[PDB]
């Protein structure tokens, strides 16, 4: 059934991916012996947030439709002291396909939106873990043409943690 093209938890040296801001927005965060890589951003404090973090190269495979799976946690605007009108709890999932396995830099207007994505759950100041509240959210973008493409994540002012990506094809 399913292809794997990209498994982000699986990846063995750098991932490679880029971020802009390069600093103070999405940041790679670990947290590993019996209790692992995470990107994070956590700026709900700050106003006009507008922190992406994009993948390399995901080669398509041929397939007309891939899938993206996304695993994350984030947490509940109510339980960030000093949140003002600028907390978020949804963060934007785009896509940008390329033939450029190589591309030098990509503006944030070349990529298209697949979705605005909402947590199932969220963590709060009671919990002291807690992966019951890890969310798994699957999209899917449609007819491709190019050889491969990049997946971008765009915070607009969420707390949150990027677990694992996975992008395959069925």
Same mark, same amino acid.
């Given at each position: 059934?399913?292809?794997?093209?990209?498994?982000?938890?699986?990846? &063995? @040296?750098?991932? @490679?991916?880029?971020?802009?801001?390069?600093?103070? @927005?999405?940041?790679?965060?670990?947290? #590993?012996?019996?209790?692992?890589?995470?990107? &994070?951003?956590?700026?709900?404090?700050?106003?006009?947030?507008?922190?992406?973090?994009?993948?390399?190269?995901?080669?398509?495979?041929?397939? &007309?439709? %891939?899938?993206?799976? /996304?695993? !994350? =946690?984030?947490?509940?605007?109510?339980?960030?002291?000093?949140?003002?009108? =600028?907390?978020?709890?949804? !963060?934007?999932?785009?896509?940008?396909?390329? #033939?450029? +396995?190589?591309?030098?830099?990509?503006?944030?207007?070349?990529?298209?939106?697949? +979705?605005? /994505?909402?947590?199932?759950?969220?963590?709060?100041?009671? #919990?002291?873990?807690?992966?019951?509240?890890?969310?798994?959210?699957?999209?899917?973008?449609?007819?491709?043409?190019?050889? @491969?493409?990049?997946?971008? !994540?765009?915070?607009?002012?969420?707390? /949150?943690?990027? %677990?694992?990506?996975? %992008?395959?094809?069925?």
């Amino acid at each position: 059934n399913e292809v794997t093209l990209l498994d982000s938890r699986s990846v &063995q @040296g750098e991932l @490679g991916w880029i971020a802009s801001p390069l600093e103070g @927005g999405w940041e790679e965060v670990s947290i #590993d012996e019996k209790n692992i890589r995470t990107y &994070q951003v956590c700026n709900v404090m700050e106003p006009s947030q507008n922190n992406w973090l994009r993948t390399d190269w995901i080669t398509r495979e041929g397939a &007309q439709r %891939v899938y993206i799976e /996304i695993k !994350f =946690t984030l947490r509940d605007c109510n339980s960030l002291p000093g949140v003002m009108g =600028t907390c978020k709890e949804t !963060f934007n999932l785009y896509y940008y396909e390329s #033939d450029n +396995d190589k591309e030098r830099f990509i503006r944030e207007n070349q990529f298209v939106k697949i +979705d605005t /994505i909402a947590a199932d759950e969220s963590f709060t100041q009671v #919990d002291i873990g807690r992966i019951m509240k890890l969310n798994t959210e699957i999209r899917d973008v449609g007819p491709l043409s190019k050889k @491969g493409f990049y997946l971008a !994540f765009q915070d607009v002012g969420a707390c /949150i943690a990027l %677990v694992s990506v996975r %992008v395959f094809y069925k």
